Design a protein around this ligand. Structure first.
Ligand SMILES: [K+]
Ligand SMILES: [K+]
Ligand SMILES: [K+]
Ligand SMILES: [K+]
Ligand SMILES: [Mg+2]
Ligand SMILES: [Mg+2]
Ligand SMILES: [Mg+2]
Ligand SMILES: [Mg+2]
Ligand SMILES: [Mg+2]
Ligand SMILES: [Mg+2]
Ligand SMILES: [Mg+2]
Ligand SMILES: [Mg+2]
Ligand SMILES: [Mg+2]
Ligand SMILES: [Mg+2]
Ligand SMILES: [Mg+2]
Ligand SMILES: [Mg+2]
Ligand SMILES: [Mg+2]
Ligand SMILES: [Mg+2]
Ligand SMILES: [Mg+2]
Ligand SMILES: [Mg+2]
Ligand SMILES: [Mg+2]
Ligand SMILES: [Mg+2]
Ligand SMILES: [Mg+2]
Ligand SMILES: [Mg+2]
Ligand SMILES: [Mg+2]
Ligand SMILES: [Mg+2]
Ligand SMILES: [Mg+2]
Ligand SMILES: [Mg+2]
Ligand SMILES: [Mg+2]
Ligand SMILES: [Mg+2]
Ligand SMILES: [Mg+2]
Ligand SMILES: [Mg+2]
Ligand SMILES: [Mg+2]
Lengths: 134, 86
RNA sequence: GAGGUAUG
RNA sequence: ACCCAUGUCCAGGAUGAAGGUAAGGUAAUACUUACUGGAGGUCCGAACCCACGCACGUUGAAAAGUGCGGGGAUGAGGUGUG
RNA sequence: UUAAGGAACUCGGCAAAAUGACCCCGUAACUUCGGGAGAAGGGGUGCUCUAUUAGGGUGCAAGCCCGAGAGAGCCGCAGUGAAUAGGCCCAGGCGACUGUUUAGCAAAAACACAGGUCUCUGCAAAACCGUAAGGUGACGUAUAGGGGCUGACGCCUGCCCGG
RNA sequence: GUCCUAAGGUAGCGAAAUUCCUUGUCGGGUAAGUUCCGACCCGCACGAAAGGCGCAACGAUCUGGGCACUGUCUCAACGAGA
RNA sequence: AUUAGCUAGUUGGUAGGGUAAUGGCCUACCAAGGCAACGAUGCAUAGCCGACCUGAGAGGGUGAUCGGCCACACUGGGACU
RNA sequence: GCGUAAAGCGCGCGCAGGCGGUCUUUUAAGUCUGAUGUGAAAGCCCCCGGCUUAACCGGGGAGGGUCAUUGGAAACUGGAAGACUGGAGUGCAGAAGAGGAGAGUGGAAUUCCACGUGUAGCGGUGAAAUGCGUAGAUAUGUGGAGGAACACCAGUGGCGAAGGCGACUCUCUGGUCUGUAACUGACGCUGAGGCGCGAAAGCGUGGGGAGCAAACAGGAUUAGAUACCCUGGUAGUCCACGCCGUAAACGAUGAGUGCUAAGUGUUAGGGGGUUUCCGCCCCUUAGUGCUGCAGCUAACGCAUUAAGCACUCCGCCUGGGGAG
RNA sequence: AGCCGCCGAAGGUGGGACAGAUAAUUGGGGUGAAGUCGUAACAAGGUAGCCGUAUCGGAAGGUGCGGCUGGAUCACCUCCU
């Protein structure tokens, strides 16, 4: 462009989207108005639990839970690891992370933080999946 | 616009006896031409190709007129009442 | 070399 | 009831169409603002005409009215004479 | 005229009450850009002095009428002090409208309306009245006249000709 | 796919001035709503000049709700006149 | 600018009063200016800076802790001392 | 960065702004420069020291401002006063042109009407059939009516900002190029926001409507055929006026200026050598096309009509889709 | 002291504007190992494709009007190497 063009309008960079929009919103009951606050993790209440058929190429059933977070946003969270404790009205803690197999999931459930009891029988990567040392 | 009439209207407003390329002369001849073309358009309203050249004459006239205004303002305030502008 | 005139 | 010819009636106020003039504006038109103008099965509202509601009357003051409100009221108007 | 309440009445707010006049501020959705609109919602109105008033009208002038704001005050519950003089808003169906109608139970969503469309008619038109003459039509002439249907405006009006 | 047809209802609208069942269902409004508004569509039995759908202004039109106002009422009392 | 007009003590002036002090700070009278596409007006956002993190640097993001300044003490207004 | 990948408004007229030919003087708005003052401490940076080193802490210095005042330079930008002409324009002499609007006009040729001659087919297809035809066609001749478009010329030829413009004549008009150096003397380039124009389709009102023809009907086709195909055929197409303002609106290539090898056609001009004009040759201007050197490009390819080398201005792009 | 006046926060009333949440219902969008009807495009994609527009149609899409080549095979014409 010409310099006069660049002065009449300077540049404008790209509008960045977050991987994790719902972690980046807080709530106050008083105002009843969402408040932008960068957050790593949120807790919620499992509305629904179920299985998913993932994309091509894959075919295994994937465990998800539809959660209502603390801030009121309804979110689908993958339940990683072998087996789980969860059911309806179960409280859950939620971190970000995208299940590439599965279309509508963008977040994971931290395993071992709350009523998400740790995985059974696991020995390796225990800090993930939330088993104590035996 | 005929040659004889053109010669008349250049020689009767020429600043001096040699001159036929002054802004006085050009602005005058343009006012003749644009008035004849205003008549032409009021008759043949949809000859937009003619209306193009009309607006080019008007633009050139305004250009000369601004230059004259910047150059000597007395020439300007003379010509406007001598010709019928504004 | 160019221009124109049924399914998997 | 409809019509024919001929007459006559409609207090007062309001709104402000077209058009026109002028200033601005233009290359010239547009166009804007003001003023003027006086249009309308226009508005408000008496007379005039009608008859929406209610009440009273209902061997009525009256064989269809009275009272309180109501609609139109320059028009597809009302009315007179023949 | 009525305590308190205020549509609980009732087929139904029937009736009644309330609003009401001049000026000023301000005024929505929608709109066929004209309207809606007096929308709504609110304020002020009396008398006295400044006042033969600022200013206007008239007149040869004297004089005679209209009376603009403002201040400064006065009195009352209340100042268009009486009488006369819109209740408003939201939503919807129907009919566009003004108008007409069952004199004497129905005023309407019915009739008409402008507009659309079909159809007929060549002029001694067609259609109508009448036995006929004679007339209307029309002292007109298919951009006119008669009949049928529809019923402003906007977007549209589909298929079927066997009967 | 097949019968019948002259051809089988288009748009638009739709428990409708039309919807029986039917106080249909859902939503709204109300403490409570067979009425009301908006949507749905199994349109008993809408539908395109017996016009369809829509629509500003208009209306003594019909309908539902609200503010104000009130002897309509709770529940009647007084006064005046005929 | 998917916000273009805004302002009416608003702009200037003559007088007057007021503050510790200049000034429409306020009052009265006169004129009708003034600002604005060099983005006024309006909406949303935000305390500002030193500085912090990053980056070859230009620059990008932040304004915890430390220091400076500003603002506010349940919300609003007002004065006294 | 925008030919083909995303990206040049469809094109113009032009207010504002940005940018601006050569020379002299004047200034010092911008620029450059010496001095003074300040830009706190802490923090970054450098140099020392201290905590068993480190982290940390201390001392000192440095840096940092489109900072301000004051004093100097005039090269460039800007302001001012003059002068000049290669830009820009007027004049003068010529040349081309389907540039546009209006009015009128011509004959081919499709259809239709009438009349003769005239007898059983015509039409169409891959085959057909629907359809027209003994109430007489098809064709053939004559005459008449109606409208729409304009063969040859006609050509990568002309003009136009683009859309686009082809039969002829007249009127009214626009723009272009060539030559001159007469005249003015930078008057200019672009151009947001505005204003207008703007294929075909389409919309409103009123005409016209011959052909072609969406829709639609019938006949075939097909598994089916809401299509290709046939026969018919309404809107439209045409005109006047006014809206609509889109396009594979495309050279998919913004306007302007200058510079950087050639070869060759073609158009409109000019200049000169030769020759009886004619004719050939060369030089040059503005266009339009072909092929190619450098150079650029991812390549294809562009190549004095750059997609090269540079400057000014505008518009636009920032992964696909959603989503125009 | 009291009283009267000016300014004056909150409050009340009123109608508009602005921003958001929600809503019977509705619209299209997208995603989703193996469902459905057809085959519109890619080659001449079997009617050449595509742009705009109108209309029609279960759906892709078709037809008309104009426009482009981002058009395959065959032809004469211009032009070049
Ligand atoms: K229903
Ligand atoms: K002030
Ligand atoms: K038409
Ligand atoms: K083209
Ligand atoms: Mg296949
Ligand atoms: Mg009237
Ligand atoms: Mg009335
Ligand atoms: Mg009465
Ligand atoms: Mg009246
Ligand atoms: Mg009488
Ligand atoms: Mg009589
Ligand atoms: Mg009472
Ligand atoms: Mg009481
Ligand atoms: Mg009740
Ligand atoms: Mg009861
Ligand atoms: Mg009543
Ligand atoms: Mg009526
Ligand atoms: Mg009666
Ligand atoms: Mg009655
Ligand atoms: Mg009629
Ligand atoms: Mg007779
Ligand atoms: Mg009727
Ligand atoms: Mg009822
Ligand atoms: Mg019909
Ligand atoms: Mg009436
Ligand atoms: Mg804040
Ligand atoms: Mg970098
Ligand atoms: Mg592209
Ligand atoms: Mg420091
Ligand atoms: Mg057209
Ligand atoms: Mg195909
Ligand atoms: Mg194909
Ligand atoms: Mg078709």
């Amino acid at each position: 462009p010409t310099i006069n063009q660049l002065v009449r309008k300077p540049r404008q960079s790209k509008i960045k989207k977050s991987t994790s929009p719902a972690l980046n919103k807080g709530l106050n009951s008083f105002k009843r108005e969402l408040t932008d606050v960068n957050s790593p993790q949120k807790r919620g209440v499992c509305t629904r639990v179920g299985t998913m058929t993932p994309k091509k190429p894959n075919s295994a059933l994937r465990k998800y839970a539809r959660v209502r977070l603390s801030n009121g946003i309804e979110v689908t969270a993958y339940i990683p690891g072998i087996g789980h404790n969860l059911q309806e009205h179960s409280v859950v803690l939620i971190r970000g992370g995208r299940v590439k197999d599965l279309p509508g999931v963008r977040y994971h459930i931290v395993r071992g933080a709350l009523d998400t009891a740790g995985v059974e029988n696991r020995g390796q990567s225990r800090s993930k999946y939330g088993t104590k040392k035996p | 616009l005929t040659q004889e009439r053109k010669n008349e209207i250049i020689a009767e407003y020429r600043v001096h006896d040699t001159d036929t390329g002054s802004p006085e002369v050009q602005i005058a001849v343009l006012t003749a031409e644009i008035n004849s073309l205003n008549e032409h358009v009021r008759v043949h309203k949809k000859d937009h190709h003619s209306y193009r050249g009309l607006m080019k004459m008007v633009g050139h006239r305004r250009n000369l007129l601004t230059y004259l205004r910047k150059k000597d303002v007395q020439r300007y305030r003379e010509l406007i009442k001598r010709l019928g502008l504004r």
